[PDB]
Structures are given as structure tokens and as C-alpha cells.
Swiss-Prot record:
Note from the entry: Lysozyme C is capable of both hydrolysis and transglycosylation; it also shows a slight esterase activity. It acts rapidly on both peptide-substituted and unsubstituted peptidoglycan, and slowly on chitin oligosaccharides.
Name this protein carries in UniProt: Lysozyme C
Record note on quaternary structure: Monomer.
GO molecular function: beta-N-acetylglucosaminidase activity; identical protein binding; lysozyme activity
Amino-acid positions noted as binding substrate in the UniProt annotation, renumbered to this chain: D101
Class of this enzyme: hydrolase
Keywords for this protein: Allergen, Antimicrobial, Bacteriolytic enzyme, Disulfide bond, Glycosidase, Hydrolase, Secreted, Signal
Tissue specificity remark: In the egg white and polymorphonuclear leukocytes.
């Protein structure tokens, strides 16, 4: 599924992301936009043997198990295929874990390079909450 901006904002809000660990909703929407272009099926296969999965491009070395990645930690305790669903629940739950495991949103390269320092509120502006 390819989400709309406001639709994804609403879904993320329903799942508790607004102000999760001090990160406003627009940060999360921005991260998804630049990680996956809102596409729940996005995959990026890396040359290091890992793969980035889903709307938030969560990597298979630390976070989910795909059975093919060296050094797998599976800290979200899920198969990576769960991150490719049309429902965002698994991706949100794992994203929460990523920040709970001592990272901030700097874990997402696209957030650090394309969202940090910007008017992230723009990503939710005009939307029904």
C-alpha cells in the first residue's frame, strides 16, 4: 500500500507515536516519506547482506529476522516479513523499540539528513487528526 500523508499521520497517531520519547508526529511522517515514499512494501537489499524493510526501512541486522543476514540480533523479535504488511502496527512497534534501545531518531538516515532541522509540522499540516 502507498499511504497518503494525512492518512499515515492519522494511523501513526492512533498507534501512539505523537510525542513518543519527545518526537512529534511530523517527525515520524517525515521519516516515512524519505525512507520509503510511504510504500509499505519497500525493500532495499544492501551489499552487506542485510535488507531494509517496509515503510520505515528497518534493517535486518539488528531489528528483525530474515534468516539471511549475518550477525542477526532480532531485537524486535519479529520476522522481517511482518514489516511488509499493509497495516503499520508491526513497523510502529519495532520503531518504538529502536528508540527504547537507546537510539534517537538518528537511527533513520533519512530523518537525520532530510527531516532534522526542518519544519516537520508541515507534514501534518492541513490533516484531520
Amino acid at each position: 500500500k502507498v499511504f497518503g500523508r494525512c492518512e499515515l499521520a492519522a494511523a501513526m497517531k492512533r498507534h501512539g507515536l505523537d510525542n513518543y520519547r519527545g518526537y512529534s508526529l511530523g517527525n515520524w511522517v517525515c521519516a516515512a516519506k524519505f525512507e520509503s515514499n510511504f510504500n509499505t512494501q519497500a525493500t532495499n537489499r544492501n551489499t552487506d547482506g542485510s535488507t531494509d524493510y517496509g515503510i520505515l526501512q528497518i534493517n535486518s541486522r539488528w531489528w528483525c529476522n530474515d534468516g539471511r543476514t549475518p550477525g542477526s540480533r532480532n531485537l524486535c523479535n519479529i520476522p522481517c516479513s511482518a514489516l511488509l504488511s499493509s497495516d503499520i502496527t508491526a513497523s510502529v512497534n519495532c520503531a518504538k523499540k529502536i528508540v527504547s534501545d537507546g537510539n534517537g531518531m538518528n537511527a533513520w538516515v533519512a530523518w537525520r539528513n532530510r527531516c532534522k532541522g526542518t519544519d516537520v509540522q508541515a507534514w501534518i499540516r492541513g490533516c484531520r487528526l
